[PDB]
Symmetry: none
Subunit: 320 residues, 2 copies
């Protein structure tokens, strides 16, 4: 059983933990927190998450320069369950800085652009993407898209994947999803990234609960399952059969959220592989996994133990 992840714009994450972080002060970090940098980007975090649950993946995307070397060398060190298969480009993989304040519950994030990618790079990627598709049972396409690349590319990735009988998971922003839902093929599972969204989506402006439901329903028309976030700690789940709402029983630590959403997707993938296409339970195991991730301030991908213990910390209501 094998998974392919696509991370077209990966990052080296630099997580810095400062309580009571404020503008205009010098902070001396304590002698034991060393200058460190971890592999990141959504698909790559999904790979890490899957490796923690014992599930192998091929991780692909674009990587470049010296930062690139670091990402690749570090990613390989995490587990032999992850085989790296990136397309190498000129220019550096982006560093991203996340300043996490566990006392005041804030994340201050600074994101850098990513490399300028070209048509030959995208060509090579498409060749290799097609090769790997033959070896895998499902694909996770998620995250941002680097400068240079046509925004229609994920449509081609979804299209190639579905035409080949490969089950597709997609987590992207509305602007990018609008582009996937044009094309003739569609994700099996879609989880929109609504972080900091103020934009309309599929001709739905998202103010009331009925709007979010109606958005989940629109996606459930062409995809088999939509998981749509609502008031930070809840997810609306829509399939052909009906609509559910998964709710955390407690408030979540908003500063602990880095990569929780990627633990969500990894869970859904894990469930799919181990137990098949029972969509609601997939969504649930993903939610349990996202919650476990929020129990630590770091970008933390939970293990099976940690995920299972979250099963008593949420409820599921049937909406329709």
């Amino acid at each position: 059983h094998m998974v392919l992840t696509v991370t077209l714009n990966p990052a080296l994450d630099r997580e810095i933990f400062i309580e009571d972080f404020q503008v205009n002060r010098l902070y001396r970090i304590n002698d034991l927190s060393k200058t460190q940098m971890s592999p990141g980007g959504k698909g790559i975090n999904v790979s890490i998450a899957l490796s923690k649950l014992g599930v192998p993946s091929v991780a692909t995307g674009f990587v470049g320069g010296y930062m690139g070397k670091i990402l690749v060398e570090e990613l390989r060190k995490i587990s032999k369950l992850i085989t790296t298969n990136f397309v190498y480009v000129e220019g550096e993989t982006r560093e991203n800085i996340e300043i996490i304040d566990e006392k005041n519950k804030t994340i201050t994030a600074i994101n850098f652009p990513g490399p300028d990618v070209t048509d030959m790079d995208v060509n090579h990627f498409l060749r290799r993407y097609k090769m790997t598709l033959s070896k895998v049972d499902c694909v996770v396409i998620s995250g941002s898209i680097p400068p240079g690349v046509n925004e229609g590319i994920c449509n081609e990735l979804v299209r190639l994947a579905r035409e080949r009988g490969v089950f597709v998971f997609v987590e992207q922003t509305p602007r990018l999803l609008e582009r996937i839902y044009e094309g003739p093929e569609f994700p099996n599972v879609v989880k929109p990234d609504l972080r900091g969204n103020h934009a309309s989506f599929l001709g739905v402006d998202l103010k009331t609960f009925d709007d979010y439901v109606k958005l989940a329903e629109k996606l459930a028309e062409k995809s088999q399952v939509s998981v749509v976030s609502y008031e930070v700690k809840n997810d609306i789940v829509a399939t052909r059969e009906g609509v559910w709402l998964i709710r955390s029983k407690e408030e979540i630590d908003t500063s602990h959220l880095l990569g929780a959403g990627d633990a969500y997707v990894a869970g859904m993938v894990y469930y799919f592989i181990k137990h098949g296409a029972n969509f609601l339970e997939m969504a649930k195991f993903g939610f349990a996994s996202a919650l476990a991730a929020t129990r630590r301030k770091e970008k933390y991908m939970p293990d099976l133990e940690a995920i299972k213990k979250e099963y008593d910390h949420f409820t599921v209501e049937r909406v329709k």
Copy 2:
């Protein structure tokens, strides 16, 4: 003439320029000109500074890991005038982060501690330090110590230099300078780093102009010249002939301050090398460079043209 700079705790400085920087928000730096990355650490910046003025130096200290490699290579690209002679350690050279908000005049700075250095590493360093001293006419020892290094090392470094008739400049925090002013030999030129200081220093609690003057005088008992900062944009210069006060004629931009103090020291080193040991004029030229360094938001080590331009913008008063 040829200078040795010692930077036991080098850094890569990542400068990020964000107008209206506030906490708990995501920033996307699209413009590649709103970030800057460069070799840093006080002695390394002095080497860069001296290079702009045509004075060569050997730069020594500890470097390590991925960040270490970047530092050395970047440093070598800055000028043929800088020779590196660093002991390579296991562990990462620190990357510090400075966020500069030019609109609201703010620097939010995050300083990482640096790698653990072992006792074998420190010995290899001392052994190379001794060798370089016969090749040089003066030495600059500035900035912090990395973890695992005894705070007495700075005393040994001054002592070794001084026994061999090498002229010594030091810029370090009180705690480290206390350790230097123990030992049998003393710096020729001392410029204490008082940033963020709350402790008493040589028996003086720094709360009034007279305290800062008493401190300059105590240091001037054992060193030929002391340069002590007062209210951000002034410096008390004490020699055996008396005490002066150099003041900026105008308010400086406190957000443009990164690395200004190393420009100060570099100017003094240059003046010493070129026009001899006239101390007040050394401090004045140092002050000019410091001012020049502040004229840009980026870490900028000035050239001679930019330094001379500042002779207009400060006064000297005689205190005693």
